[PDB]
Design an enzyme around this catalytic site. Structure first.
Site, short mmCIF file in Angstrom:
data_model
loop_
_atom_site.label_atom_id
_atom_site.label_comp_id
_atom_site.label_asym_id
_atom_site.label_seq_id
_atom_site.Cartn_x
_atom_site.Cartn_y
_atom_site.Cartn_z
N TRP A 1 0.76 -1.32 0.02
CA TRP A 1 -0.44 0.07 0.06
C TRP A 1 0.92 1.57 0.17
O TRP A 1 0.79 2.15 1.15
CB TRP A 1 -0.98 -0.87 1.10
N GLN B 1 -22.32 7.36 -11.47
CA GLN B 1 -22.60 6.01 -11.17
C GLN B 1 -23.81 6.22 -9.81
O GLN B 1 -23.35 5.77 -9.14
CB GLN B 1 -21.88 4.41 -10.71
N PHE B 2 -24.79 6.71 -10.28
CA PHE B 2 -25.76 7.97 -9.84
C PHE B 2 -26.77 6.38 -8.46
O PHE B 2 -26.81 6.25 -7.52
CB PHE B 2 -27.14 7.75 -10.60
N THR B 3 -25.97 5.03 -9.22
CA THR B 3 -27.36 3.78 -8.59
C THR B 3 -26.15 3.56 -6.82
O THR B 3 -27.02 2.70 -6.88
CB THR B 3 -27.28 2.33 -9.60
#
Lengths: 154, 152
Positions: free
Chosen positions: A65, A81-83
């Protein structure tokens, strides 16, 4: 704003009009599925951009990382991505009210894409096509899925 | 428990043998499942129930109408401790909020059996839990659904 970040060795974005047409390709980098909330402020957007651009999701040598997208000269594919504001608490047909309306999300989204390009480089930031059906071949690496929701900060 | 539910035309799960395919689904759901250090079996139930019944497909002239079971589609459940990636901290994530990887795997596997008991066991595909996977996904939409059981 809500973001789902997945680490990729590449991503292929098609829209319709042999039937599907490719309009976007990254190699290594991130795919960010981006949800705009109704009450979303610019301070919220800057937070997404910061983390996408600055999250250390790659190994390098001994360490893990350790390296963010920029460090390795990687690319970014930002899809709206409105979902991600699909409410599923109440029964099984998801409910989308809390997601910002389209005309307002488009203009928001575009500011965000511009800001991505300011904080990094035009050539490194891929978009798709806003509120059009998409076919996105995503080679997931690990896989590594990060989820941030800015409404959990202040 | 957290879940990222993505709608797909198909997904190919590979491991390092340079890569070798071990799992595959066509149309259905890939579900990235993060297990929380506190998760109860009831947490698992919610995710399972939601993954199987959320009606995420058009049934010509109606939208959001058909779930994975209805269309006799498949599911790929893949484990994601990265979903409790703590990113408030700095630019380096830590993942201490996830269940420790032995109780998590036992939990995972129990979930898979329940996914199986509830659907039909030929449609639940998995990956190799502990391992590095390369998974090619054909996102259909795309359509991404996010559920945290601690939000209830």
């Amino acid at each position: 704003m809500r973001v789902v970040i997945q680490r990729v060795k590449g991503a292929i974005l098609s829209v319709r009009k042999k039937e599907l047409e490719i309009i976007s390709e990254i190699k290594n980098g991130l795919i960010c599925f981006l949800g705009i909330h109704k009450n979303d402020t610019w301070e919220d957007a800057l937070y997404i951009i910061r983390k996408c651009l600055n999250l250390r999701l790659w190994n390098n040598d001994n360490k893990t990382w350790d390296k963010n997208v920029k460090d390795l000269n990687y690319e970014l594919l930002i899809v709206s991505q409105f979902t991600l504001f699909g409410n599923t608490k109440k029964g099984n047909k998801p409910d989308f009210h809390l997601a910002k309306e389209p005309n307002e999300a488009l203009i928001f989204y575009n500011k965000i894409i511009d800001e991505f390009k300011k904080q990094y480089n035009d050539d490194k930031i891929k978009i798709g096509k806003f509120g059009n059906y998409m076919n996105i071949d995503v080679t997931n690496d690990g896989p590594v899925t990060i989820y941030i929701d800015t409404h959990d900060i202040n």
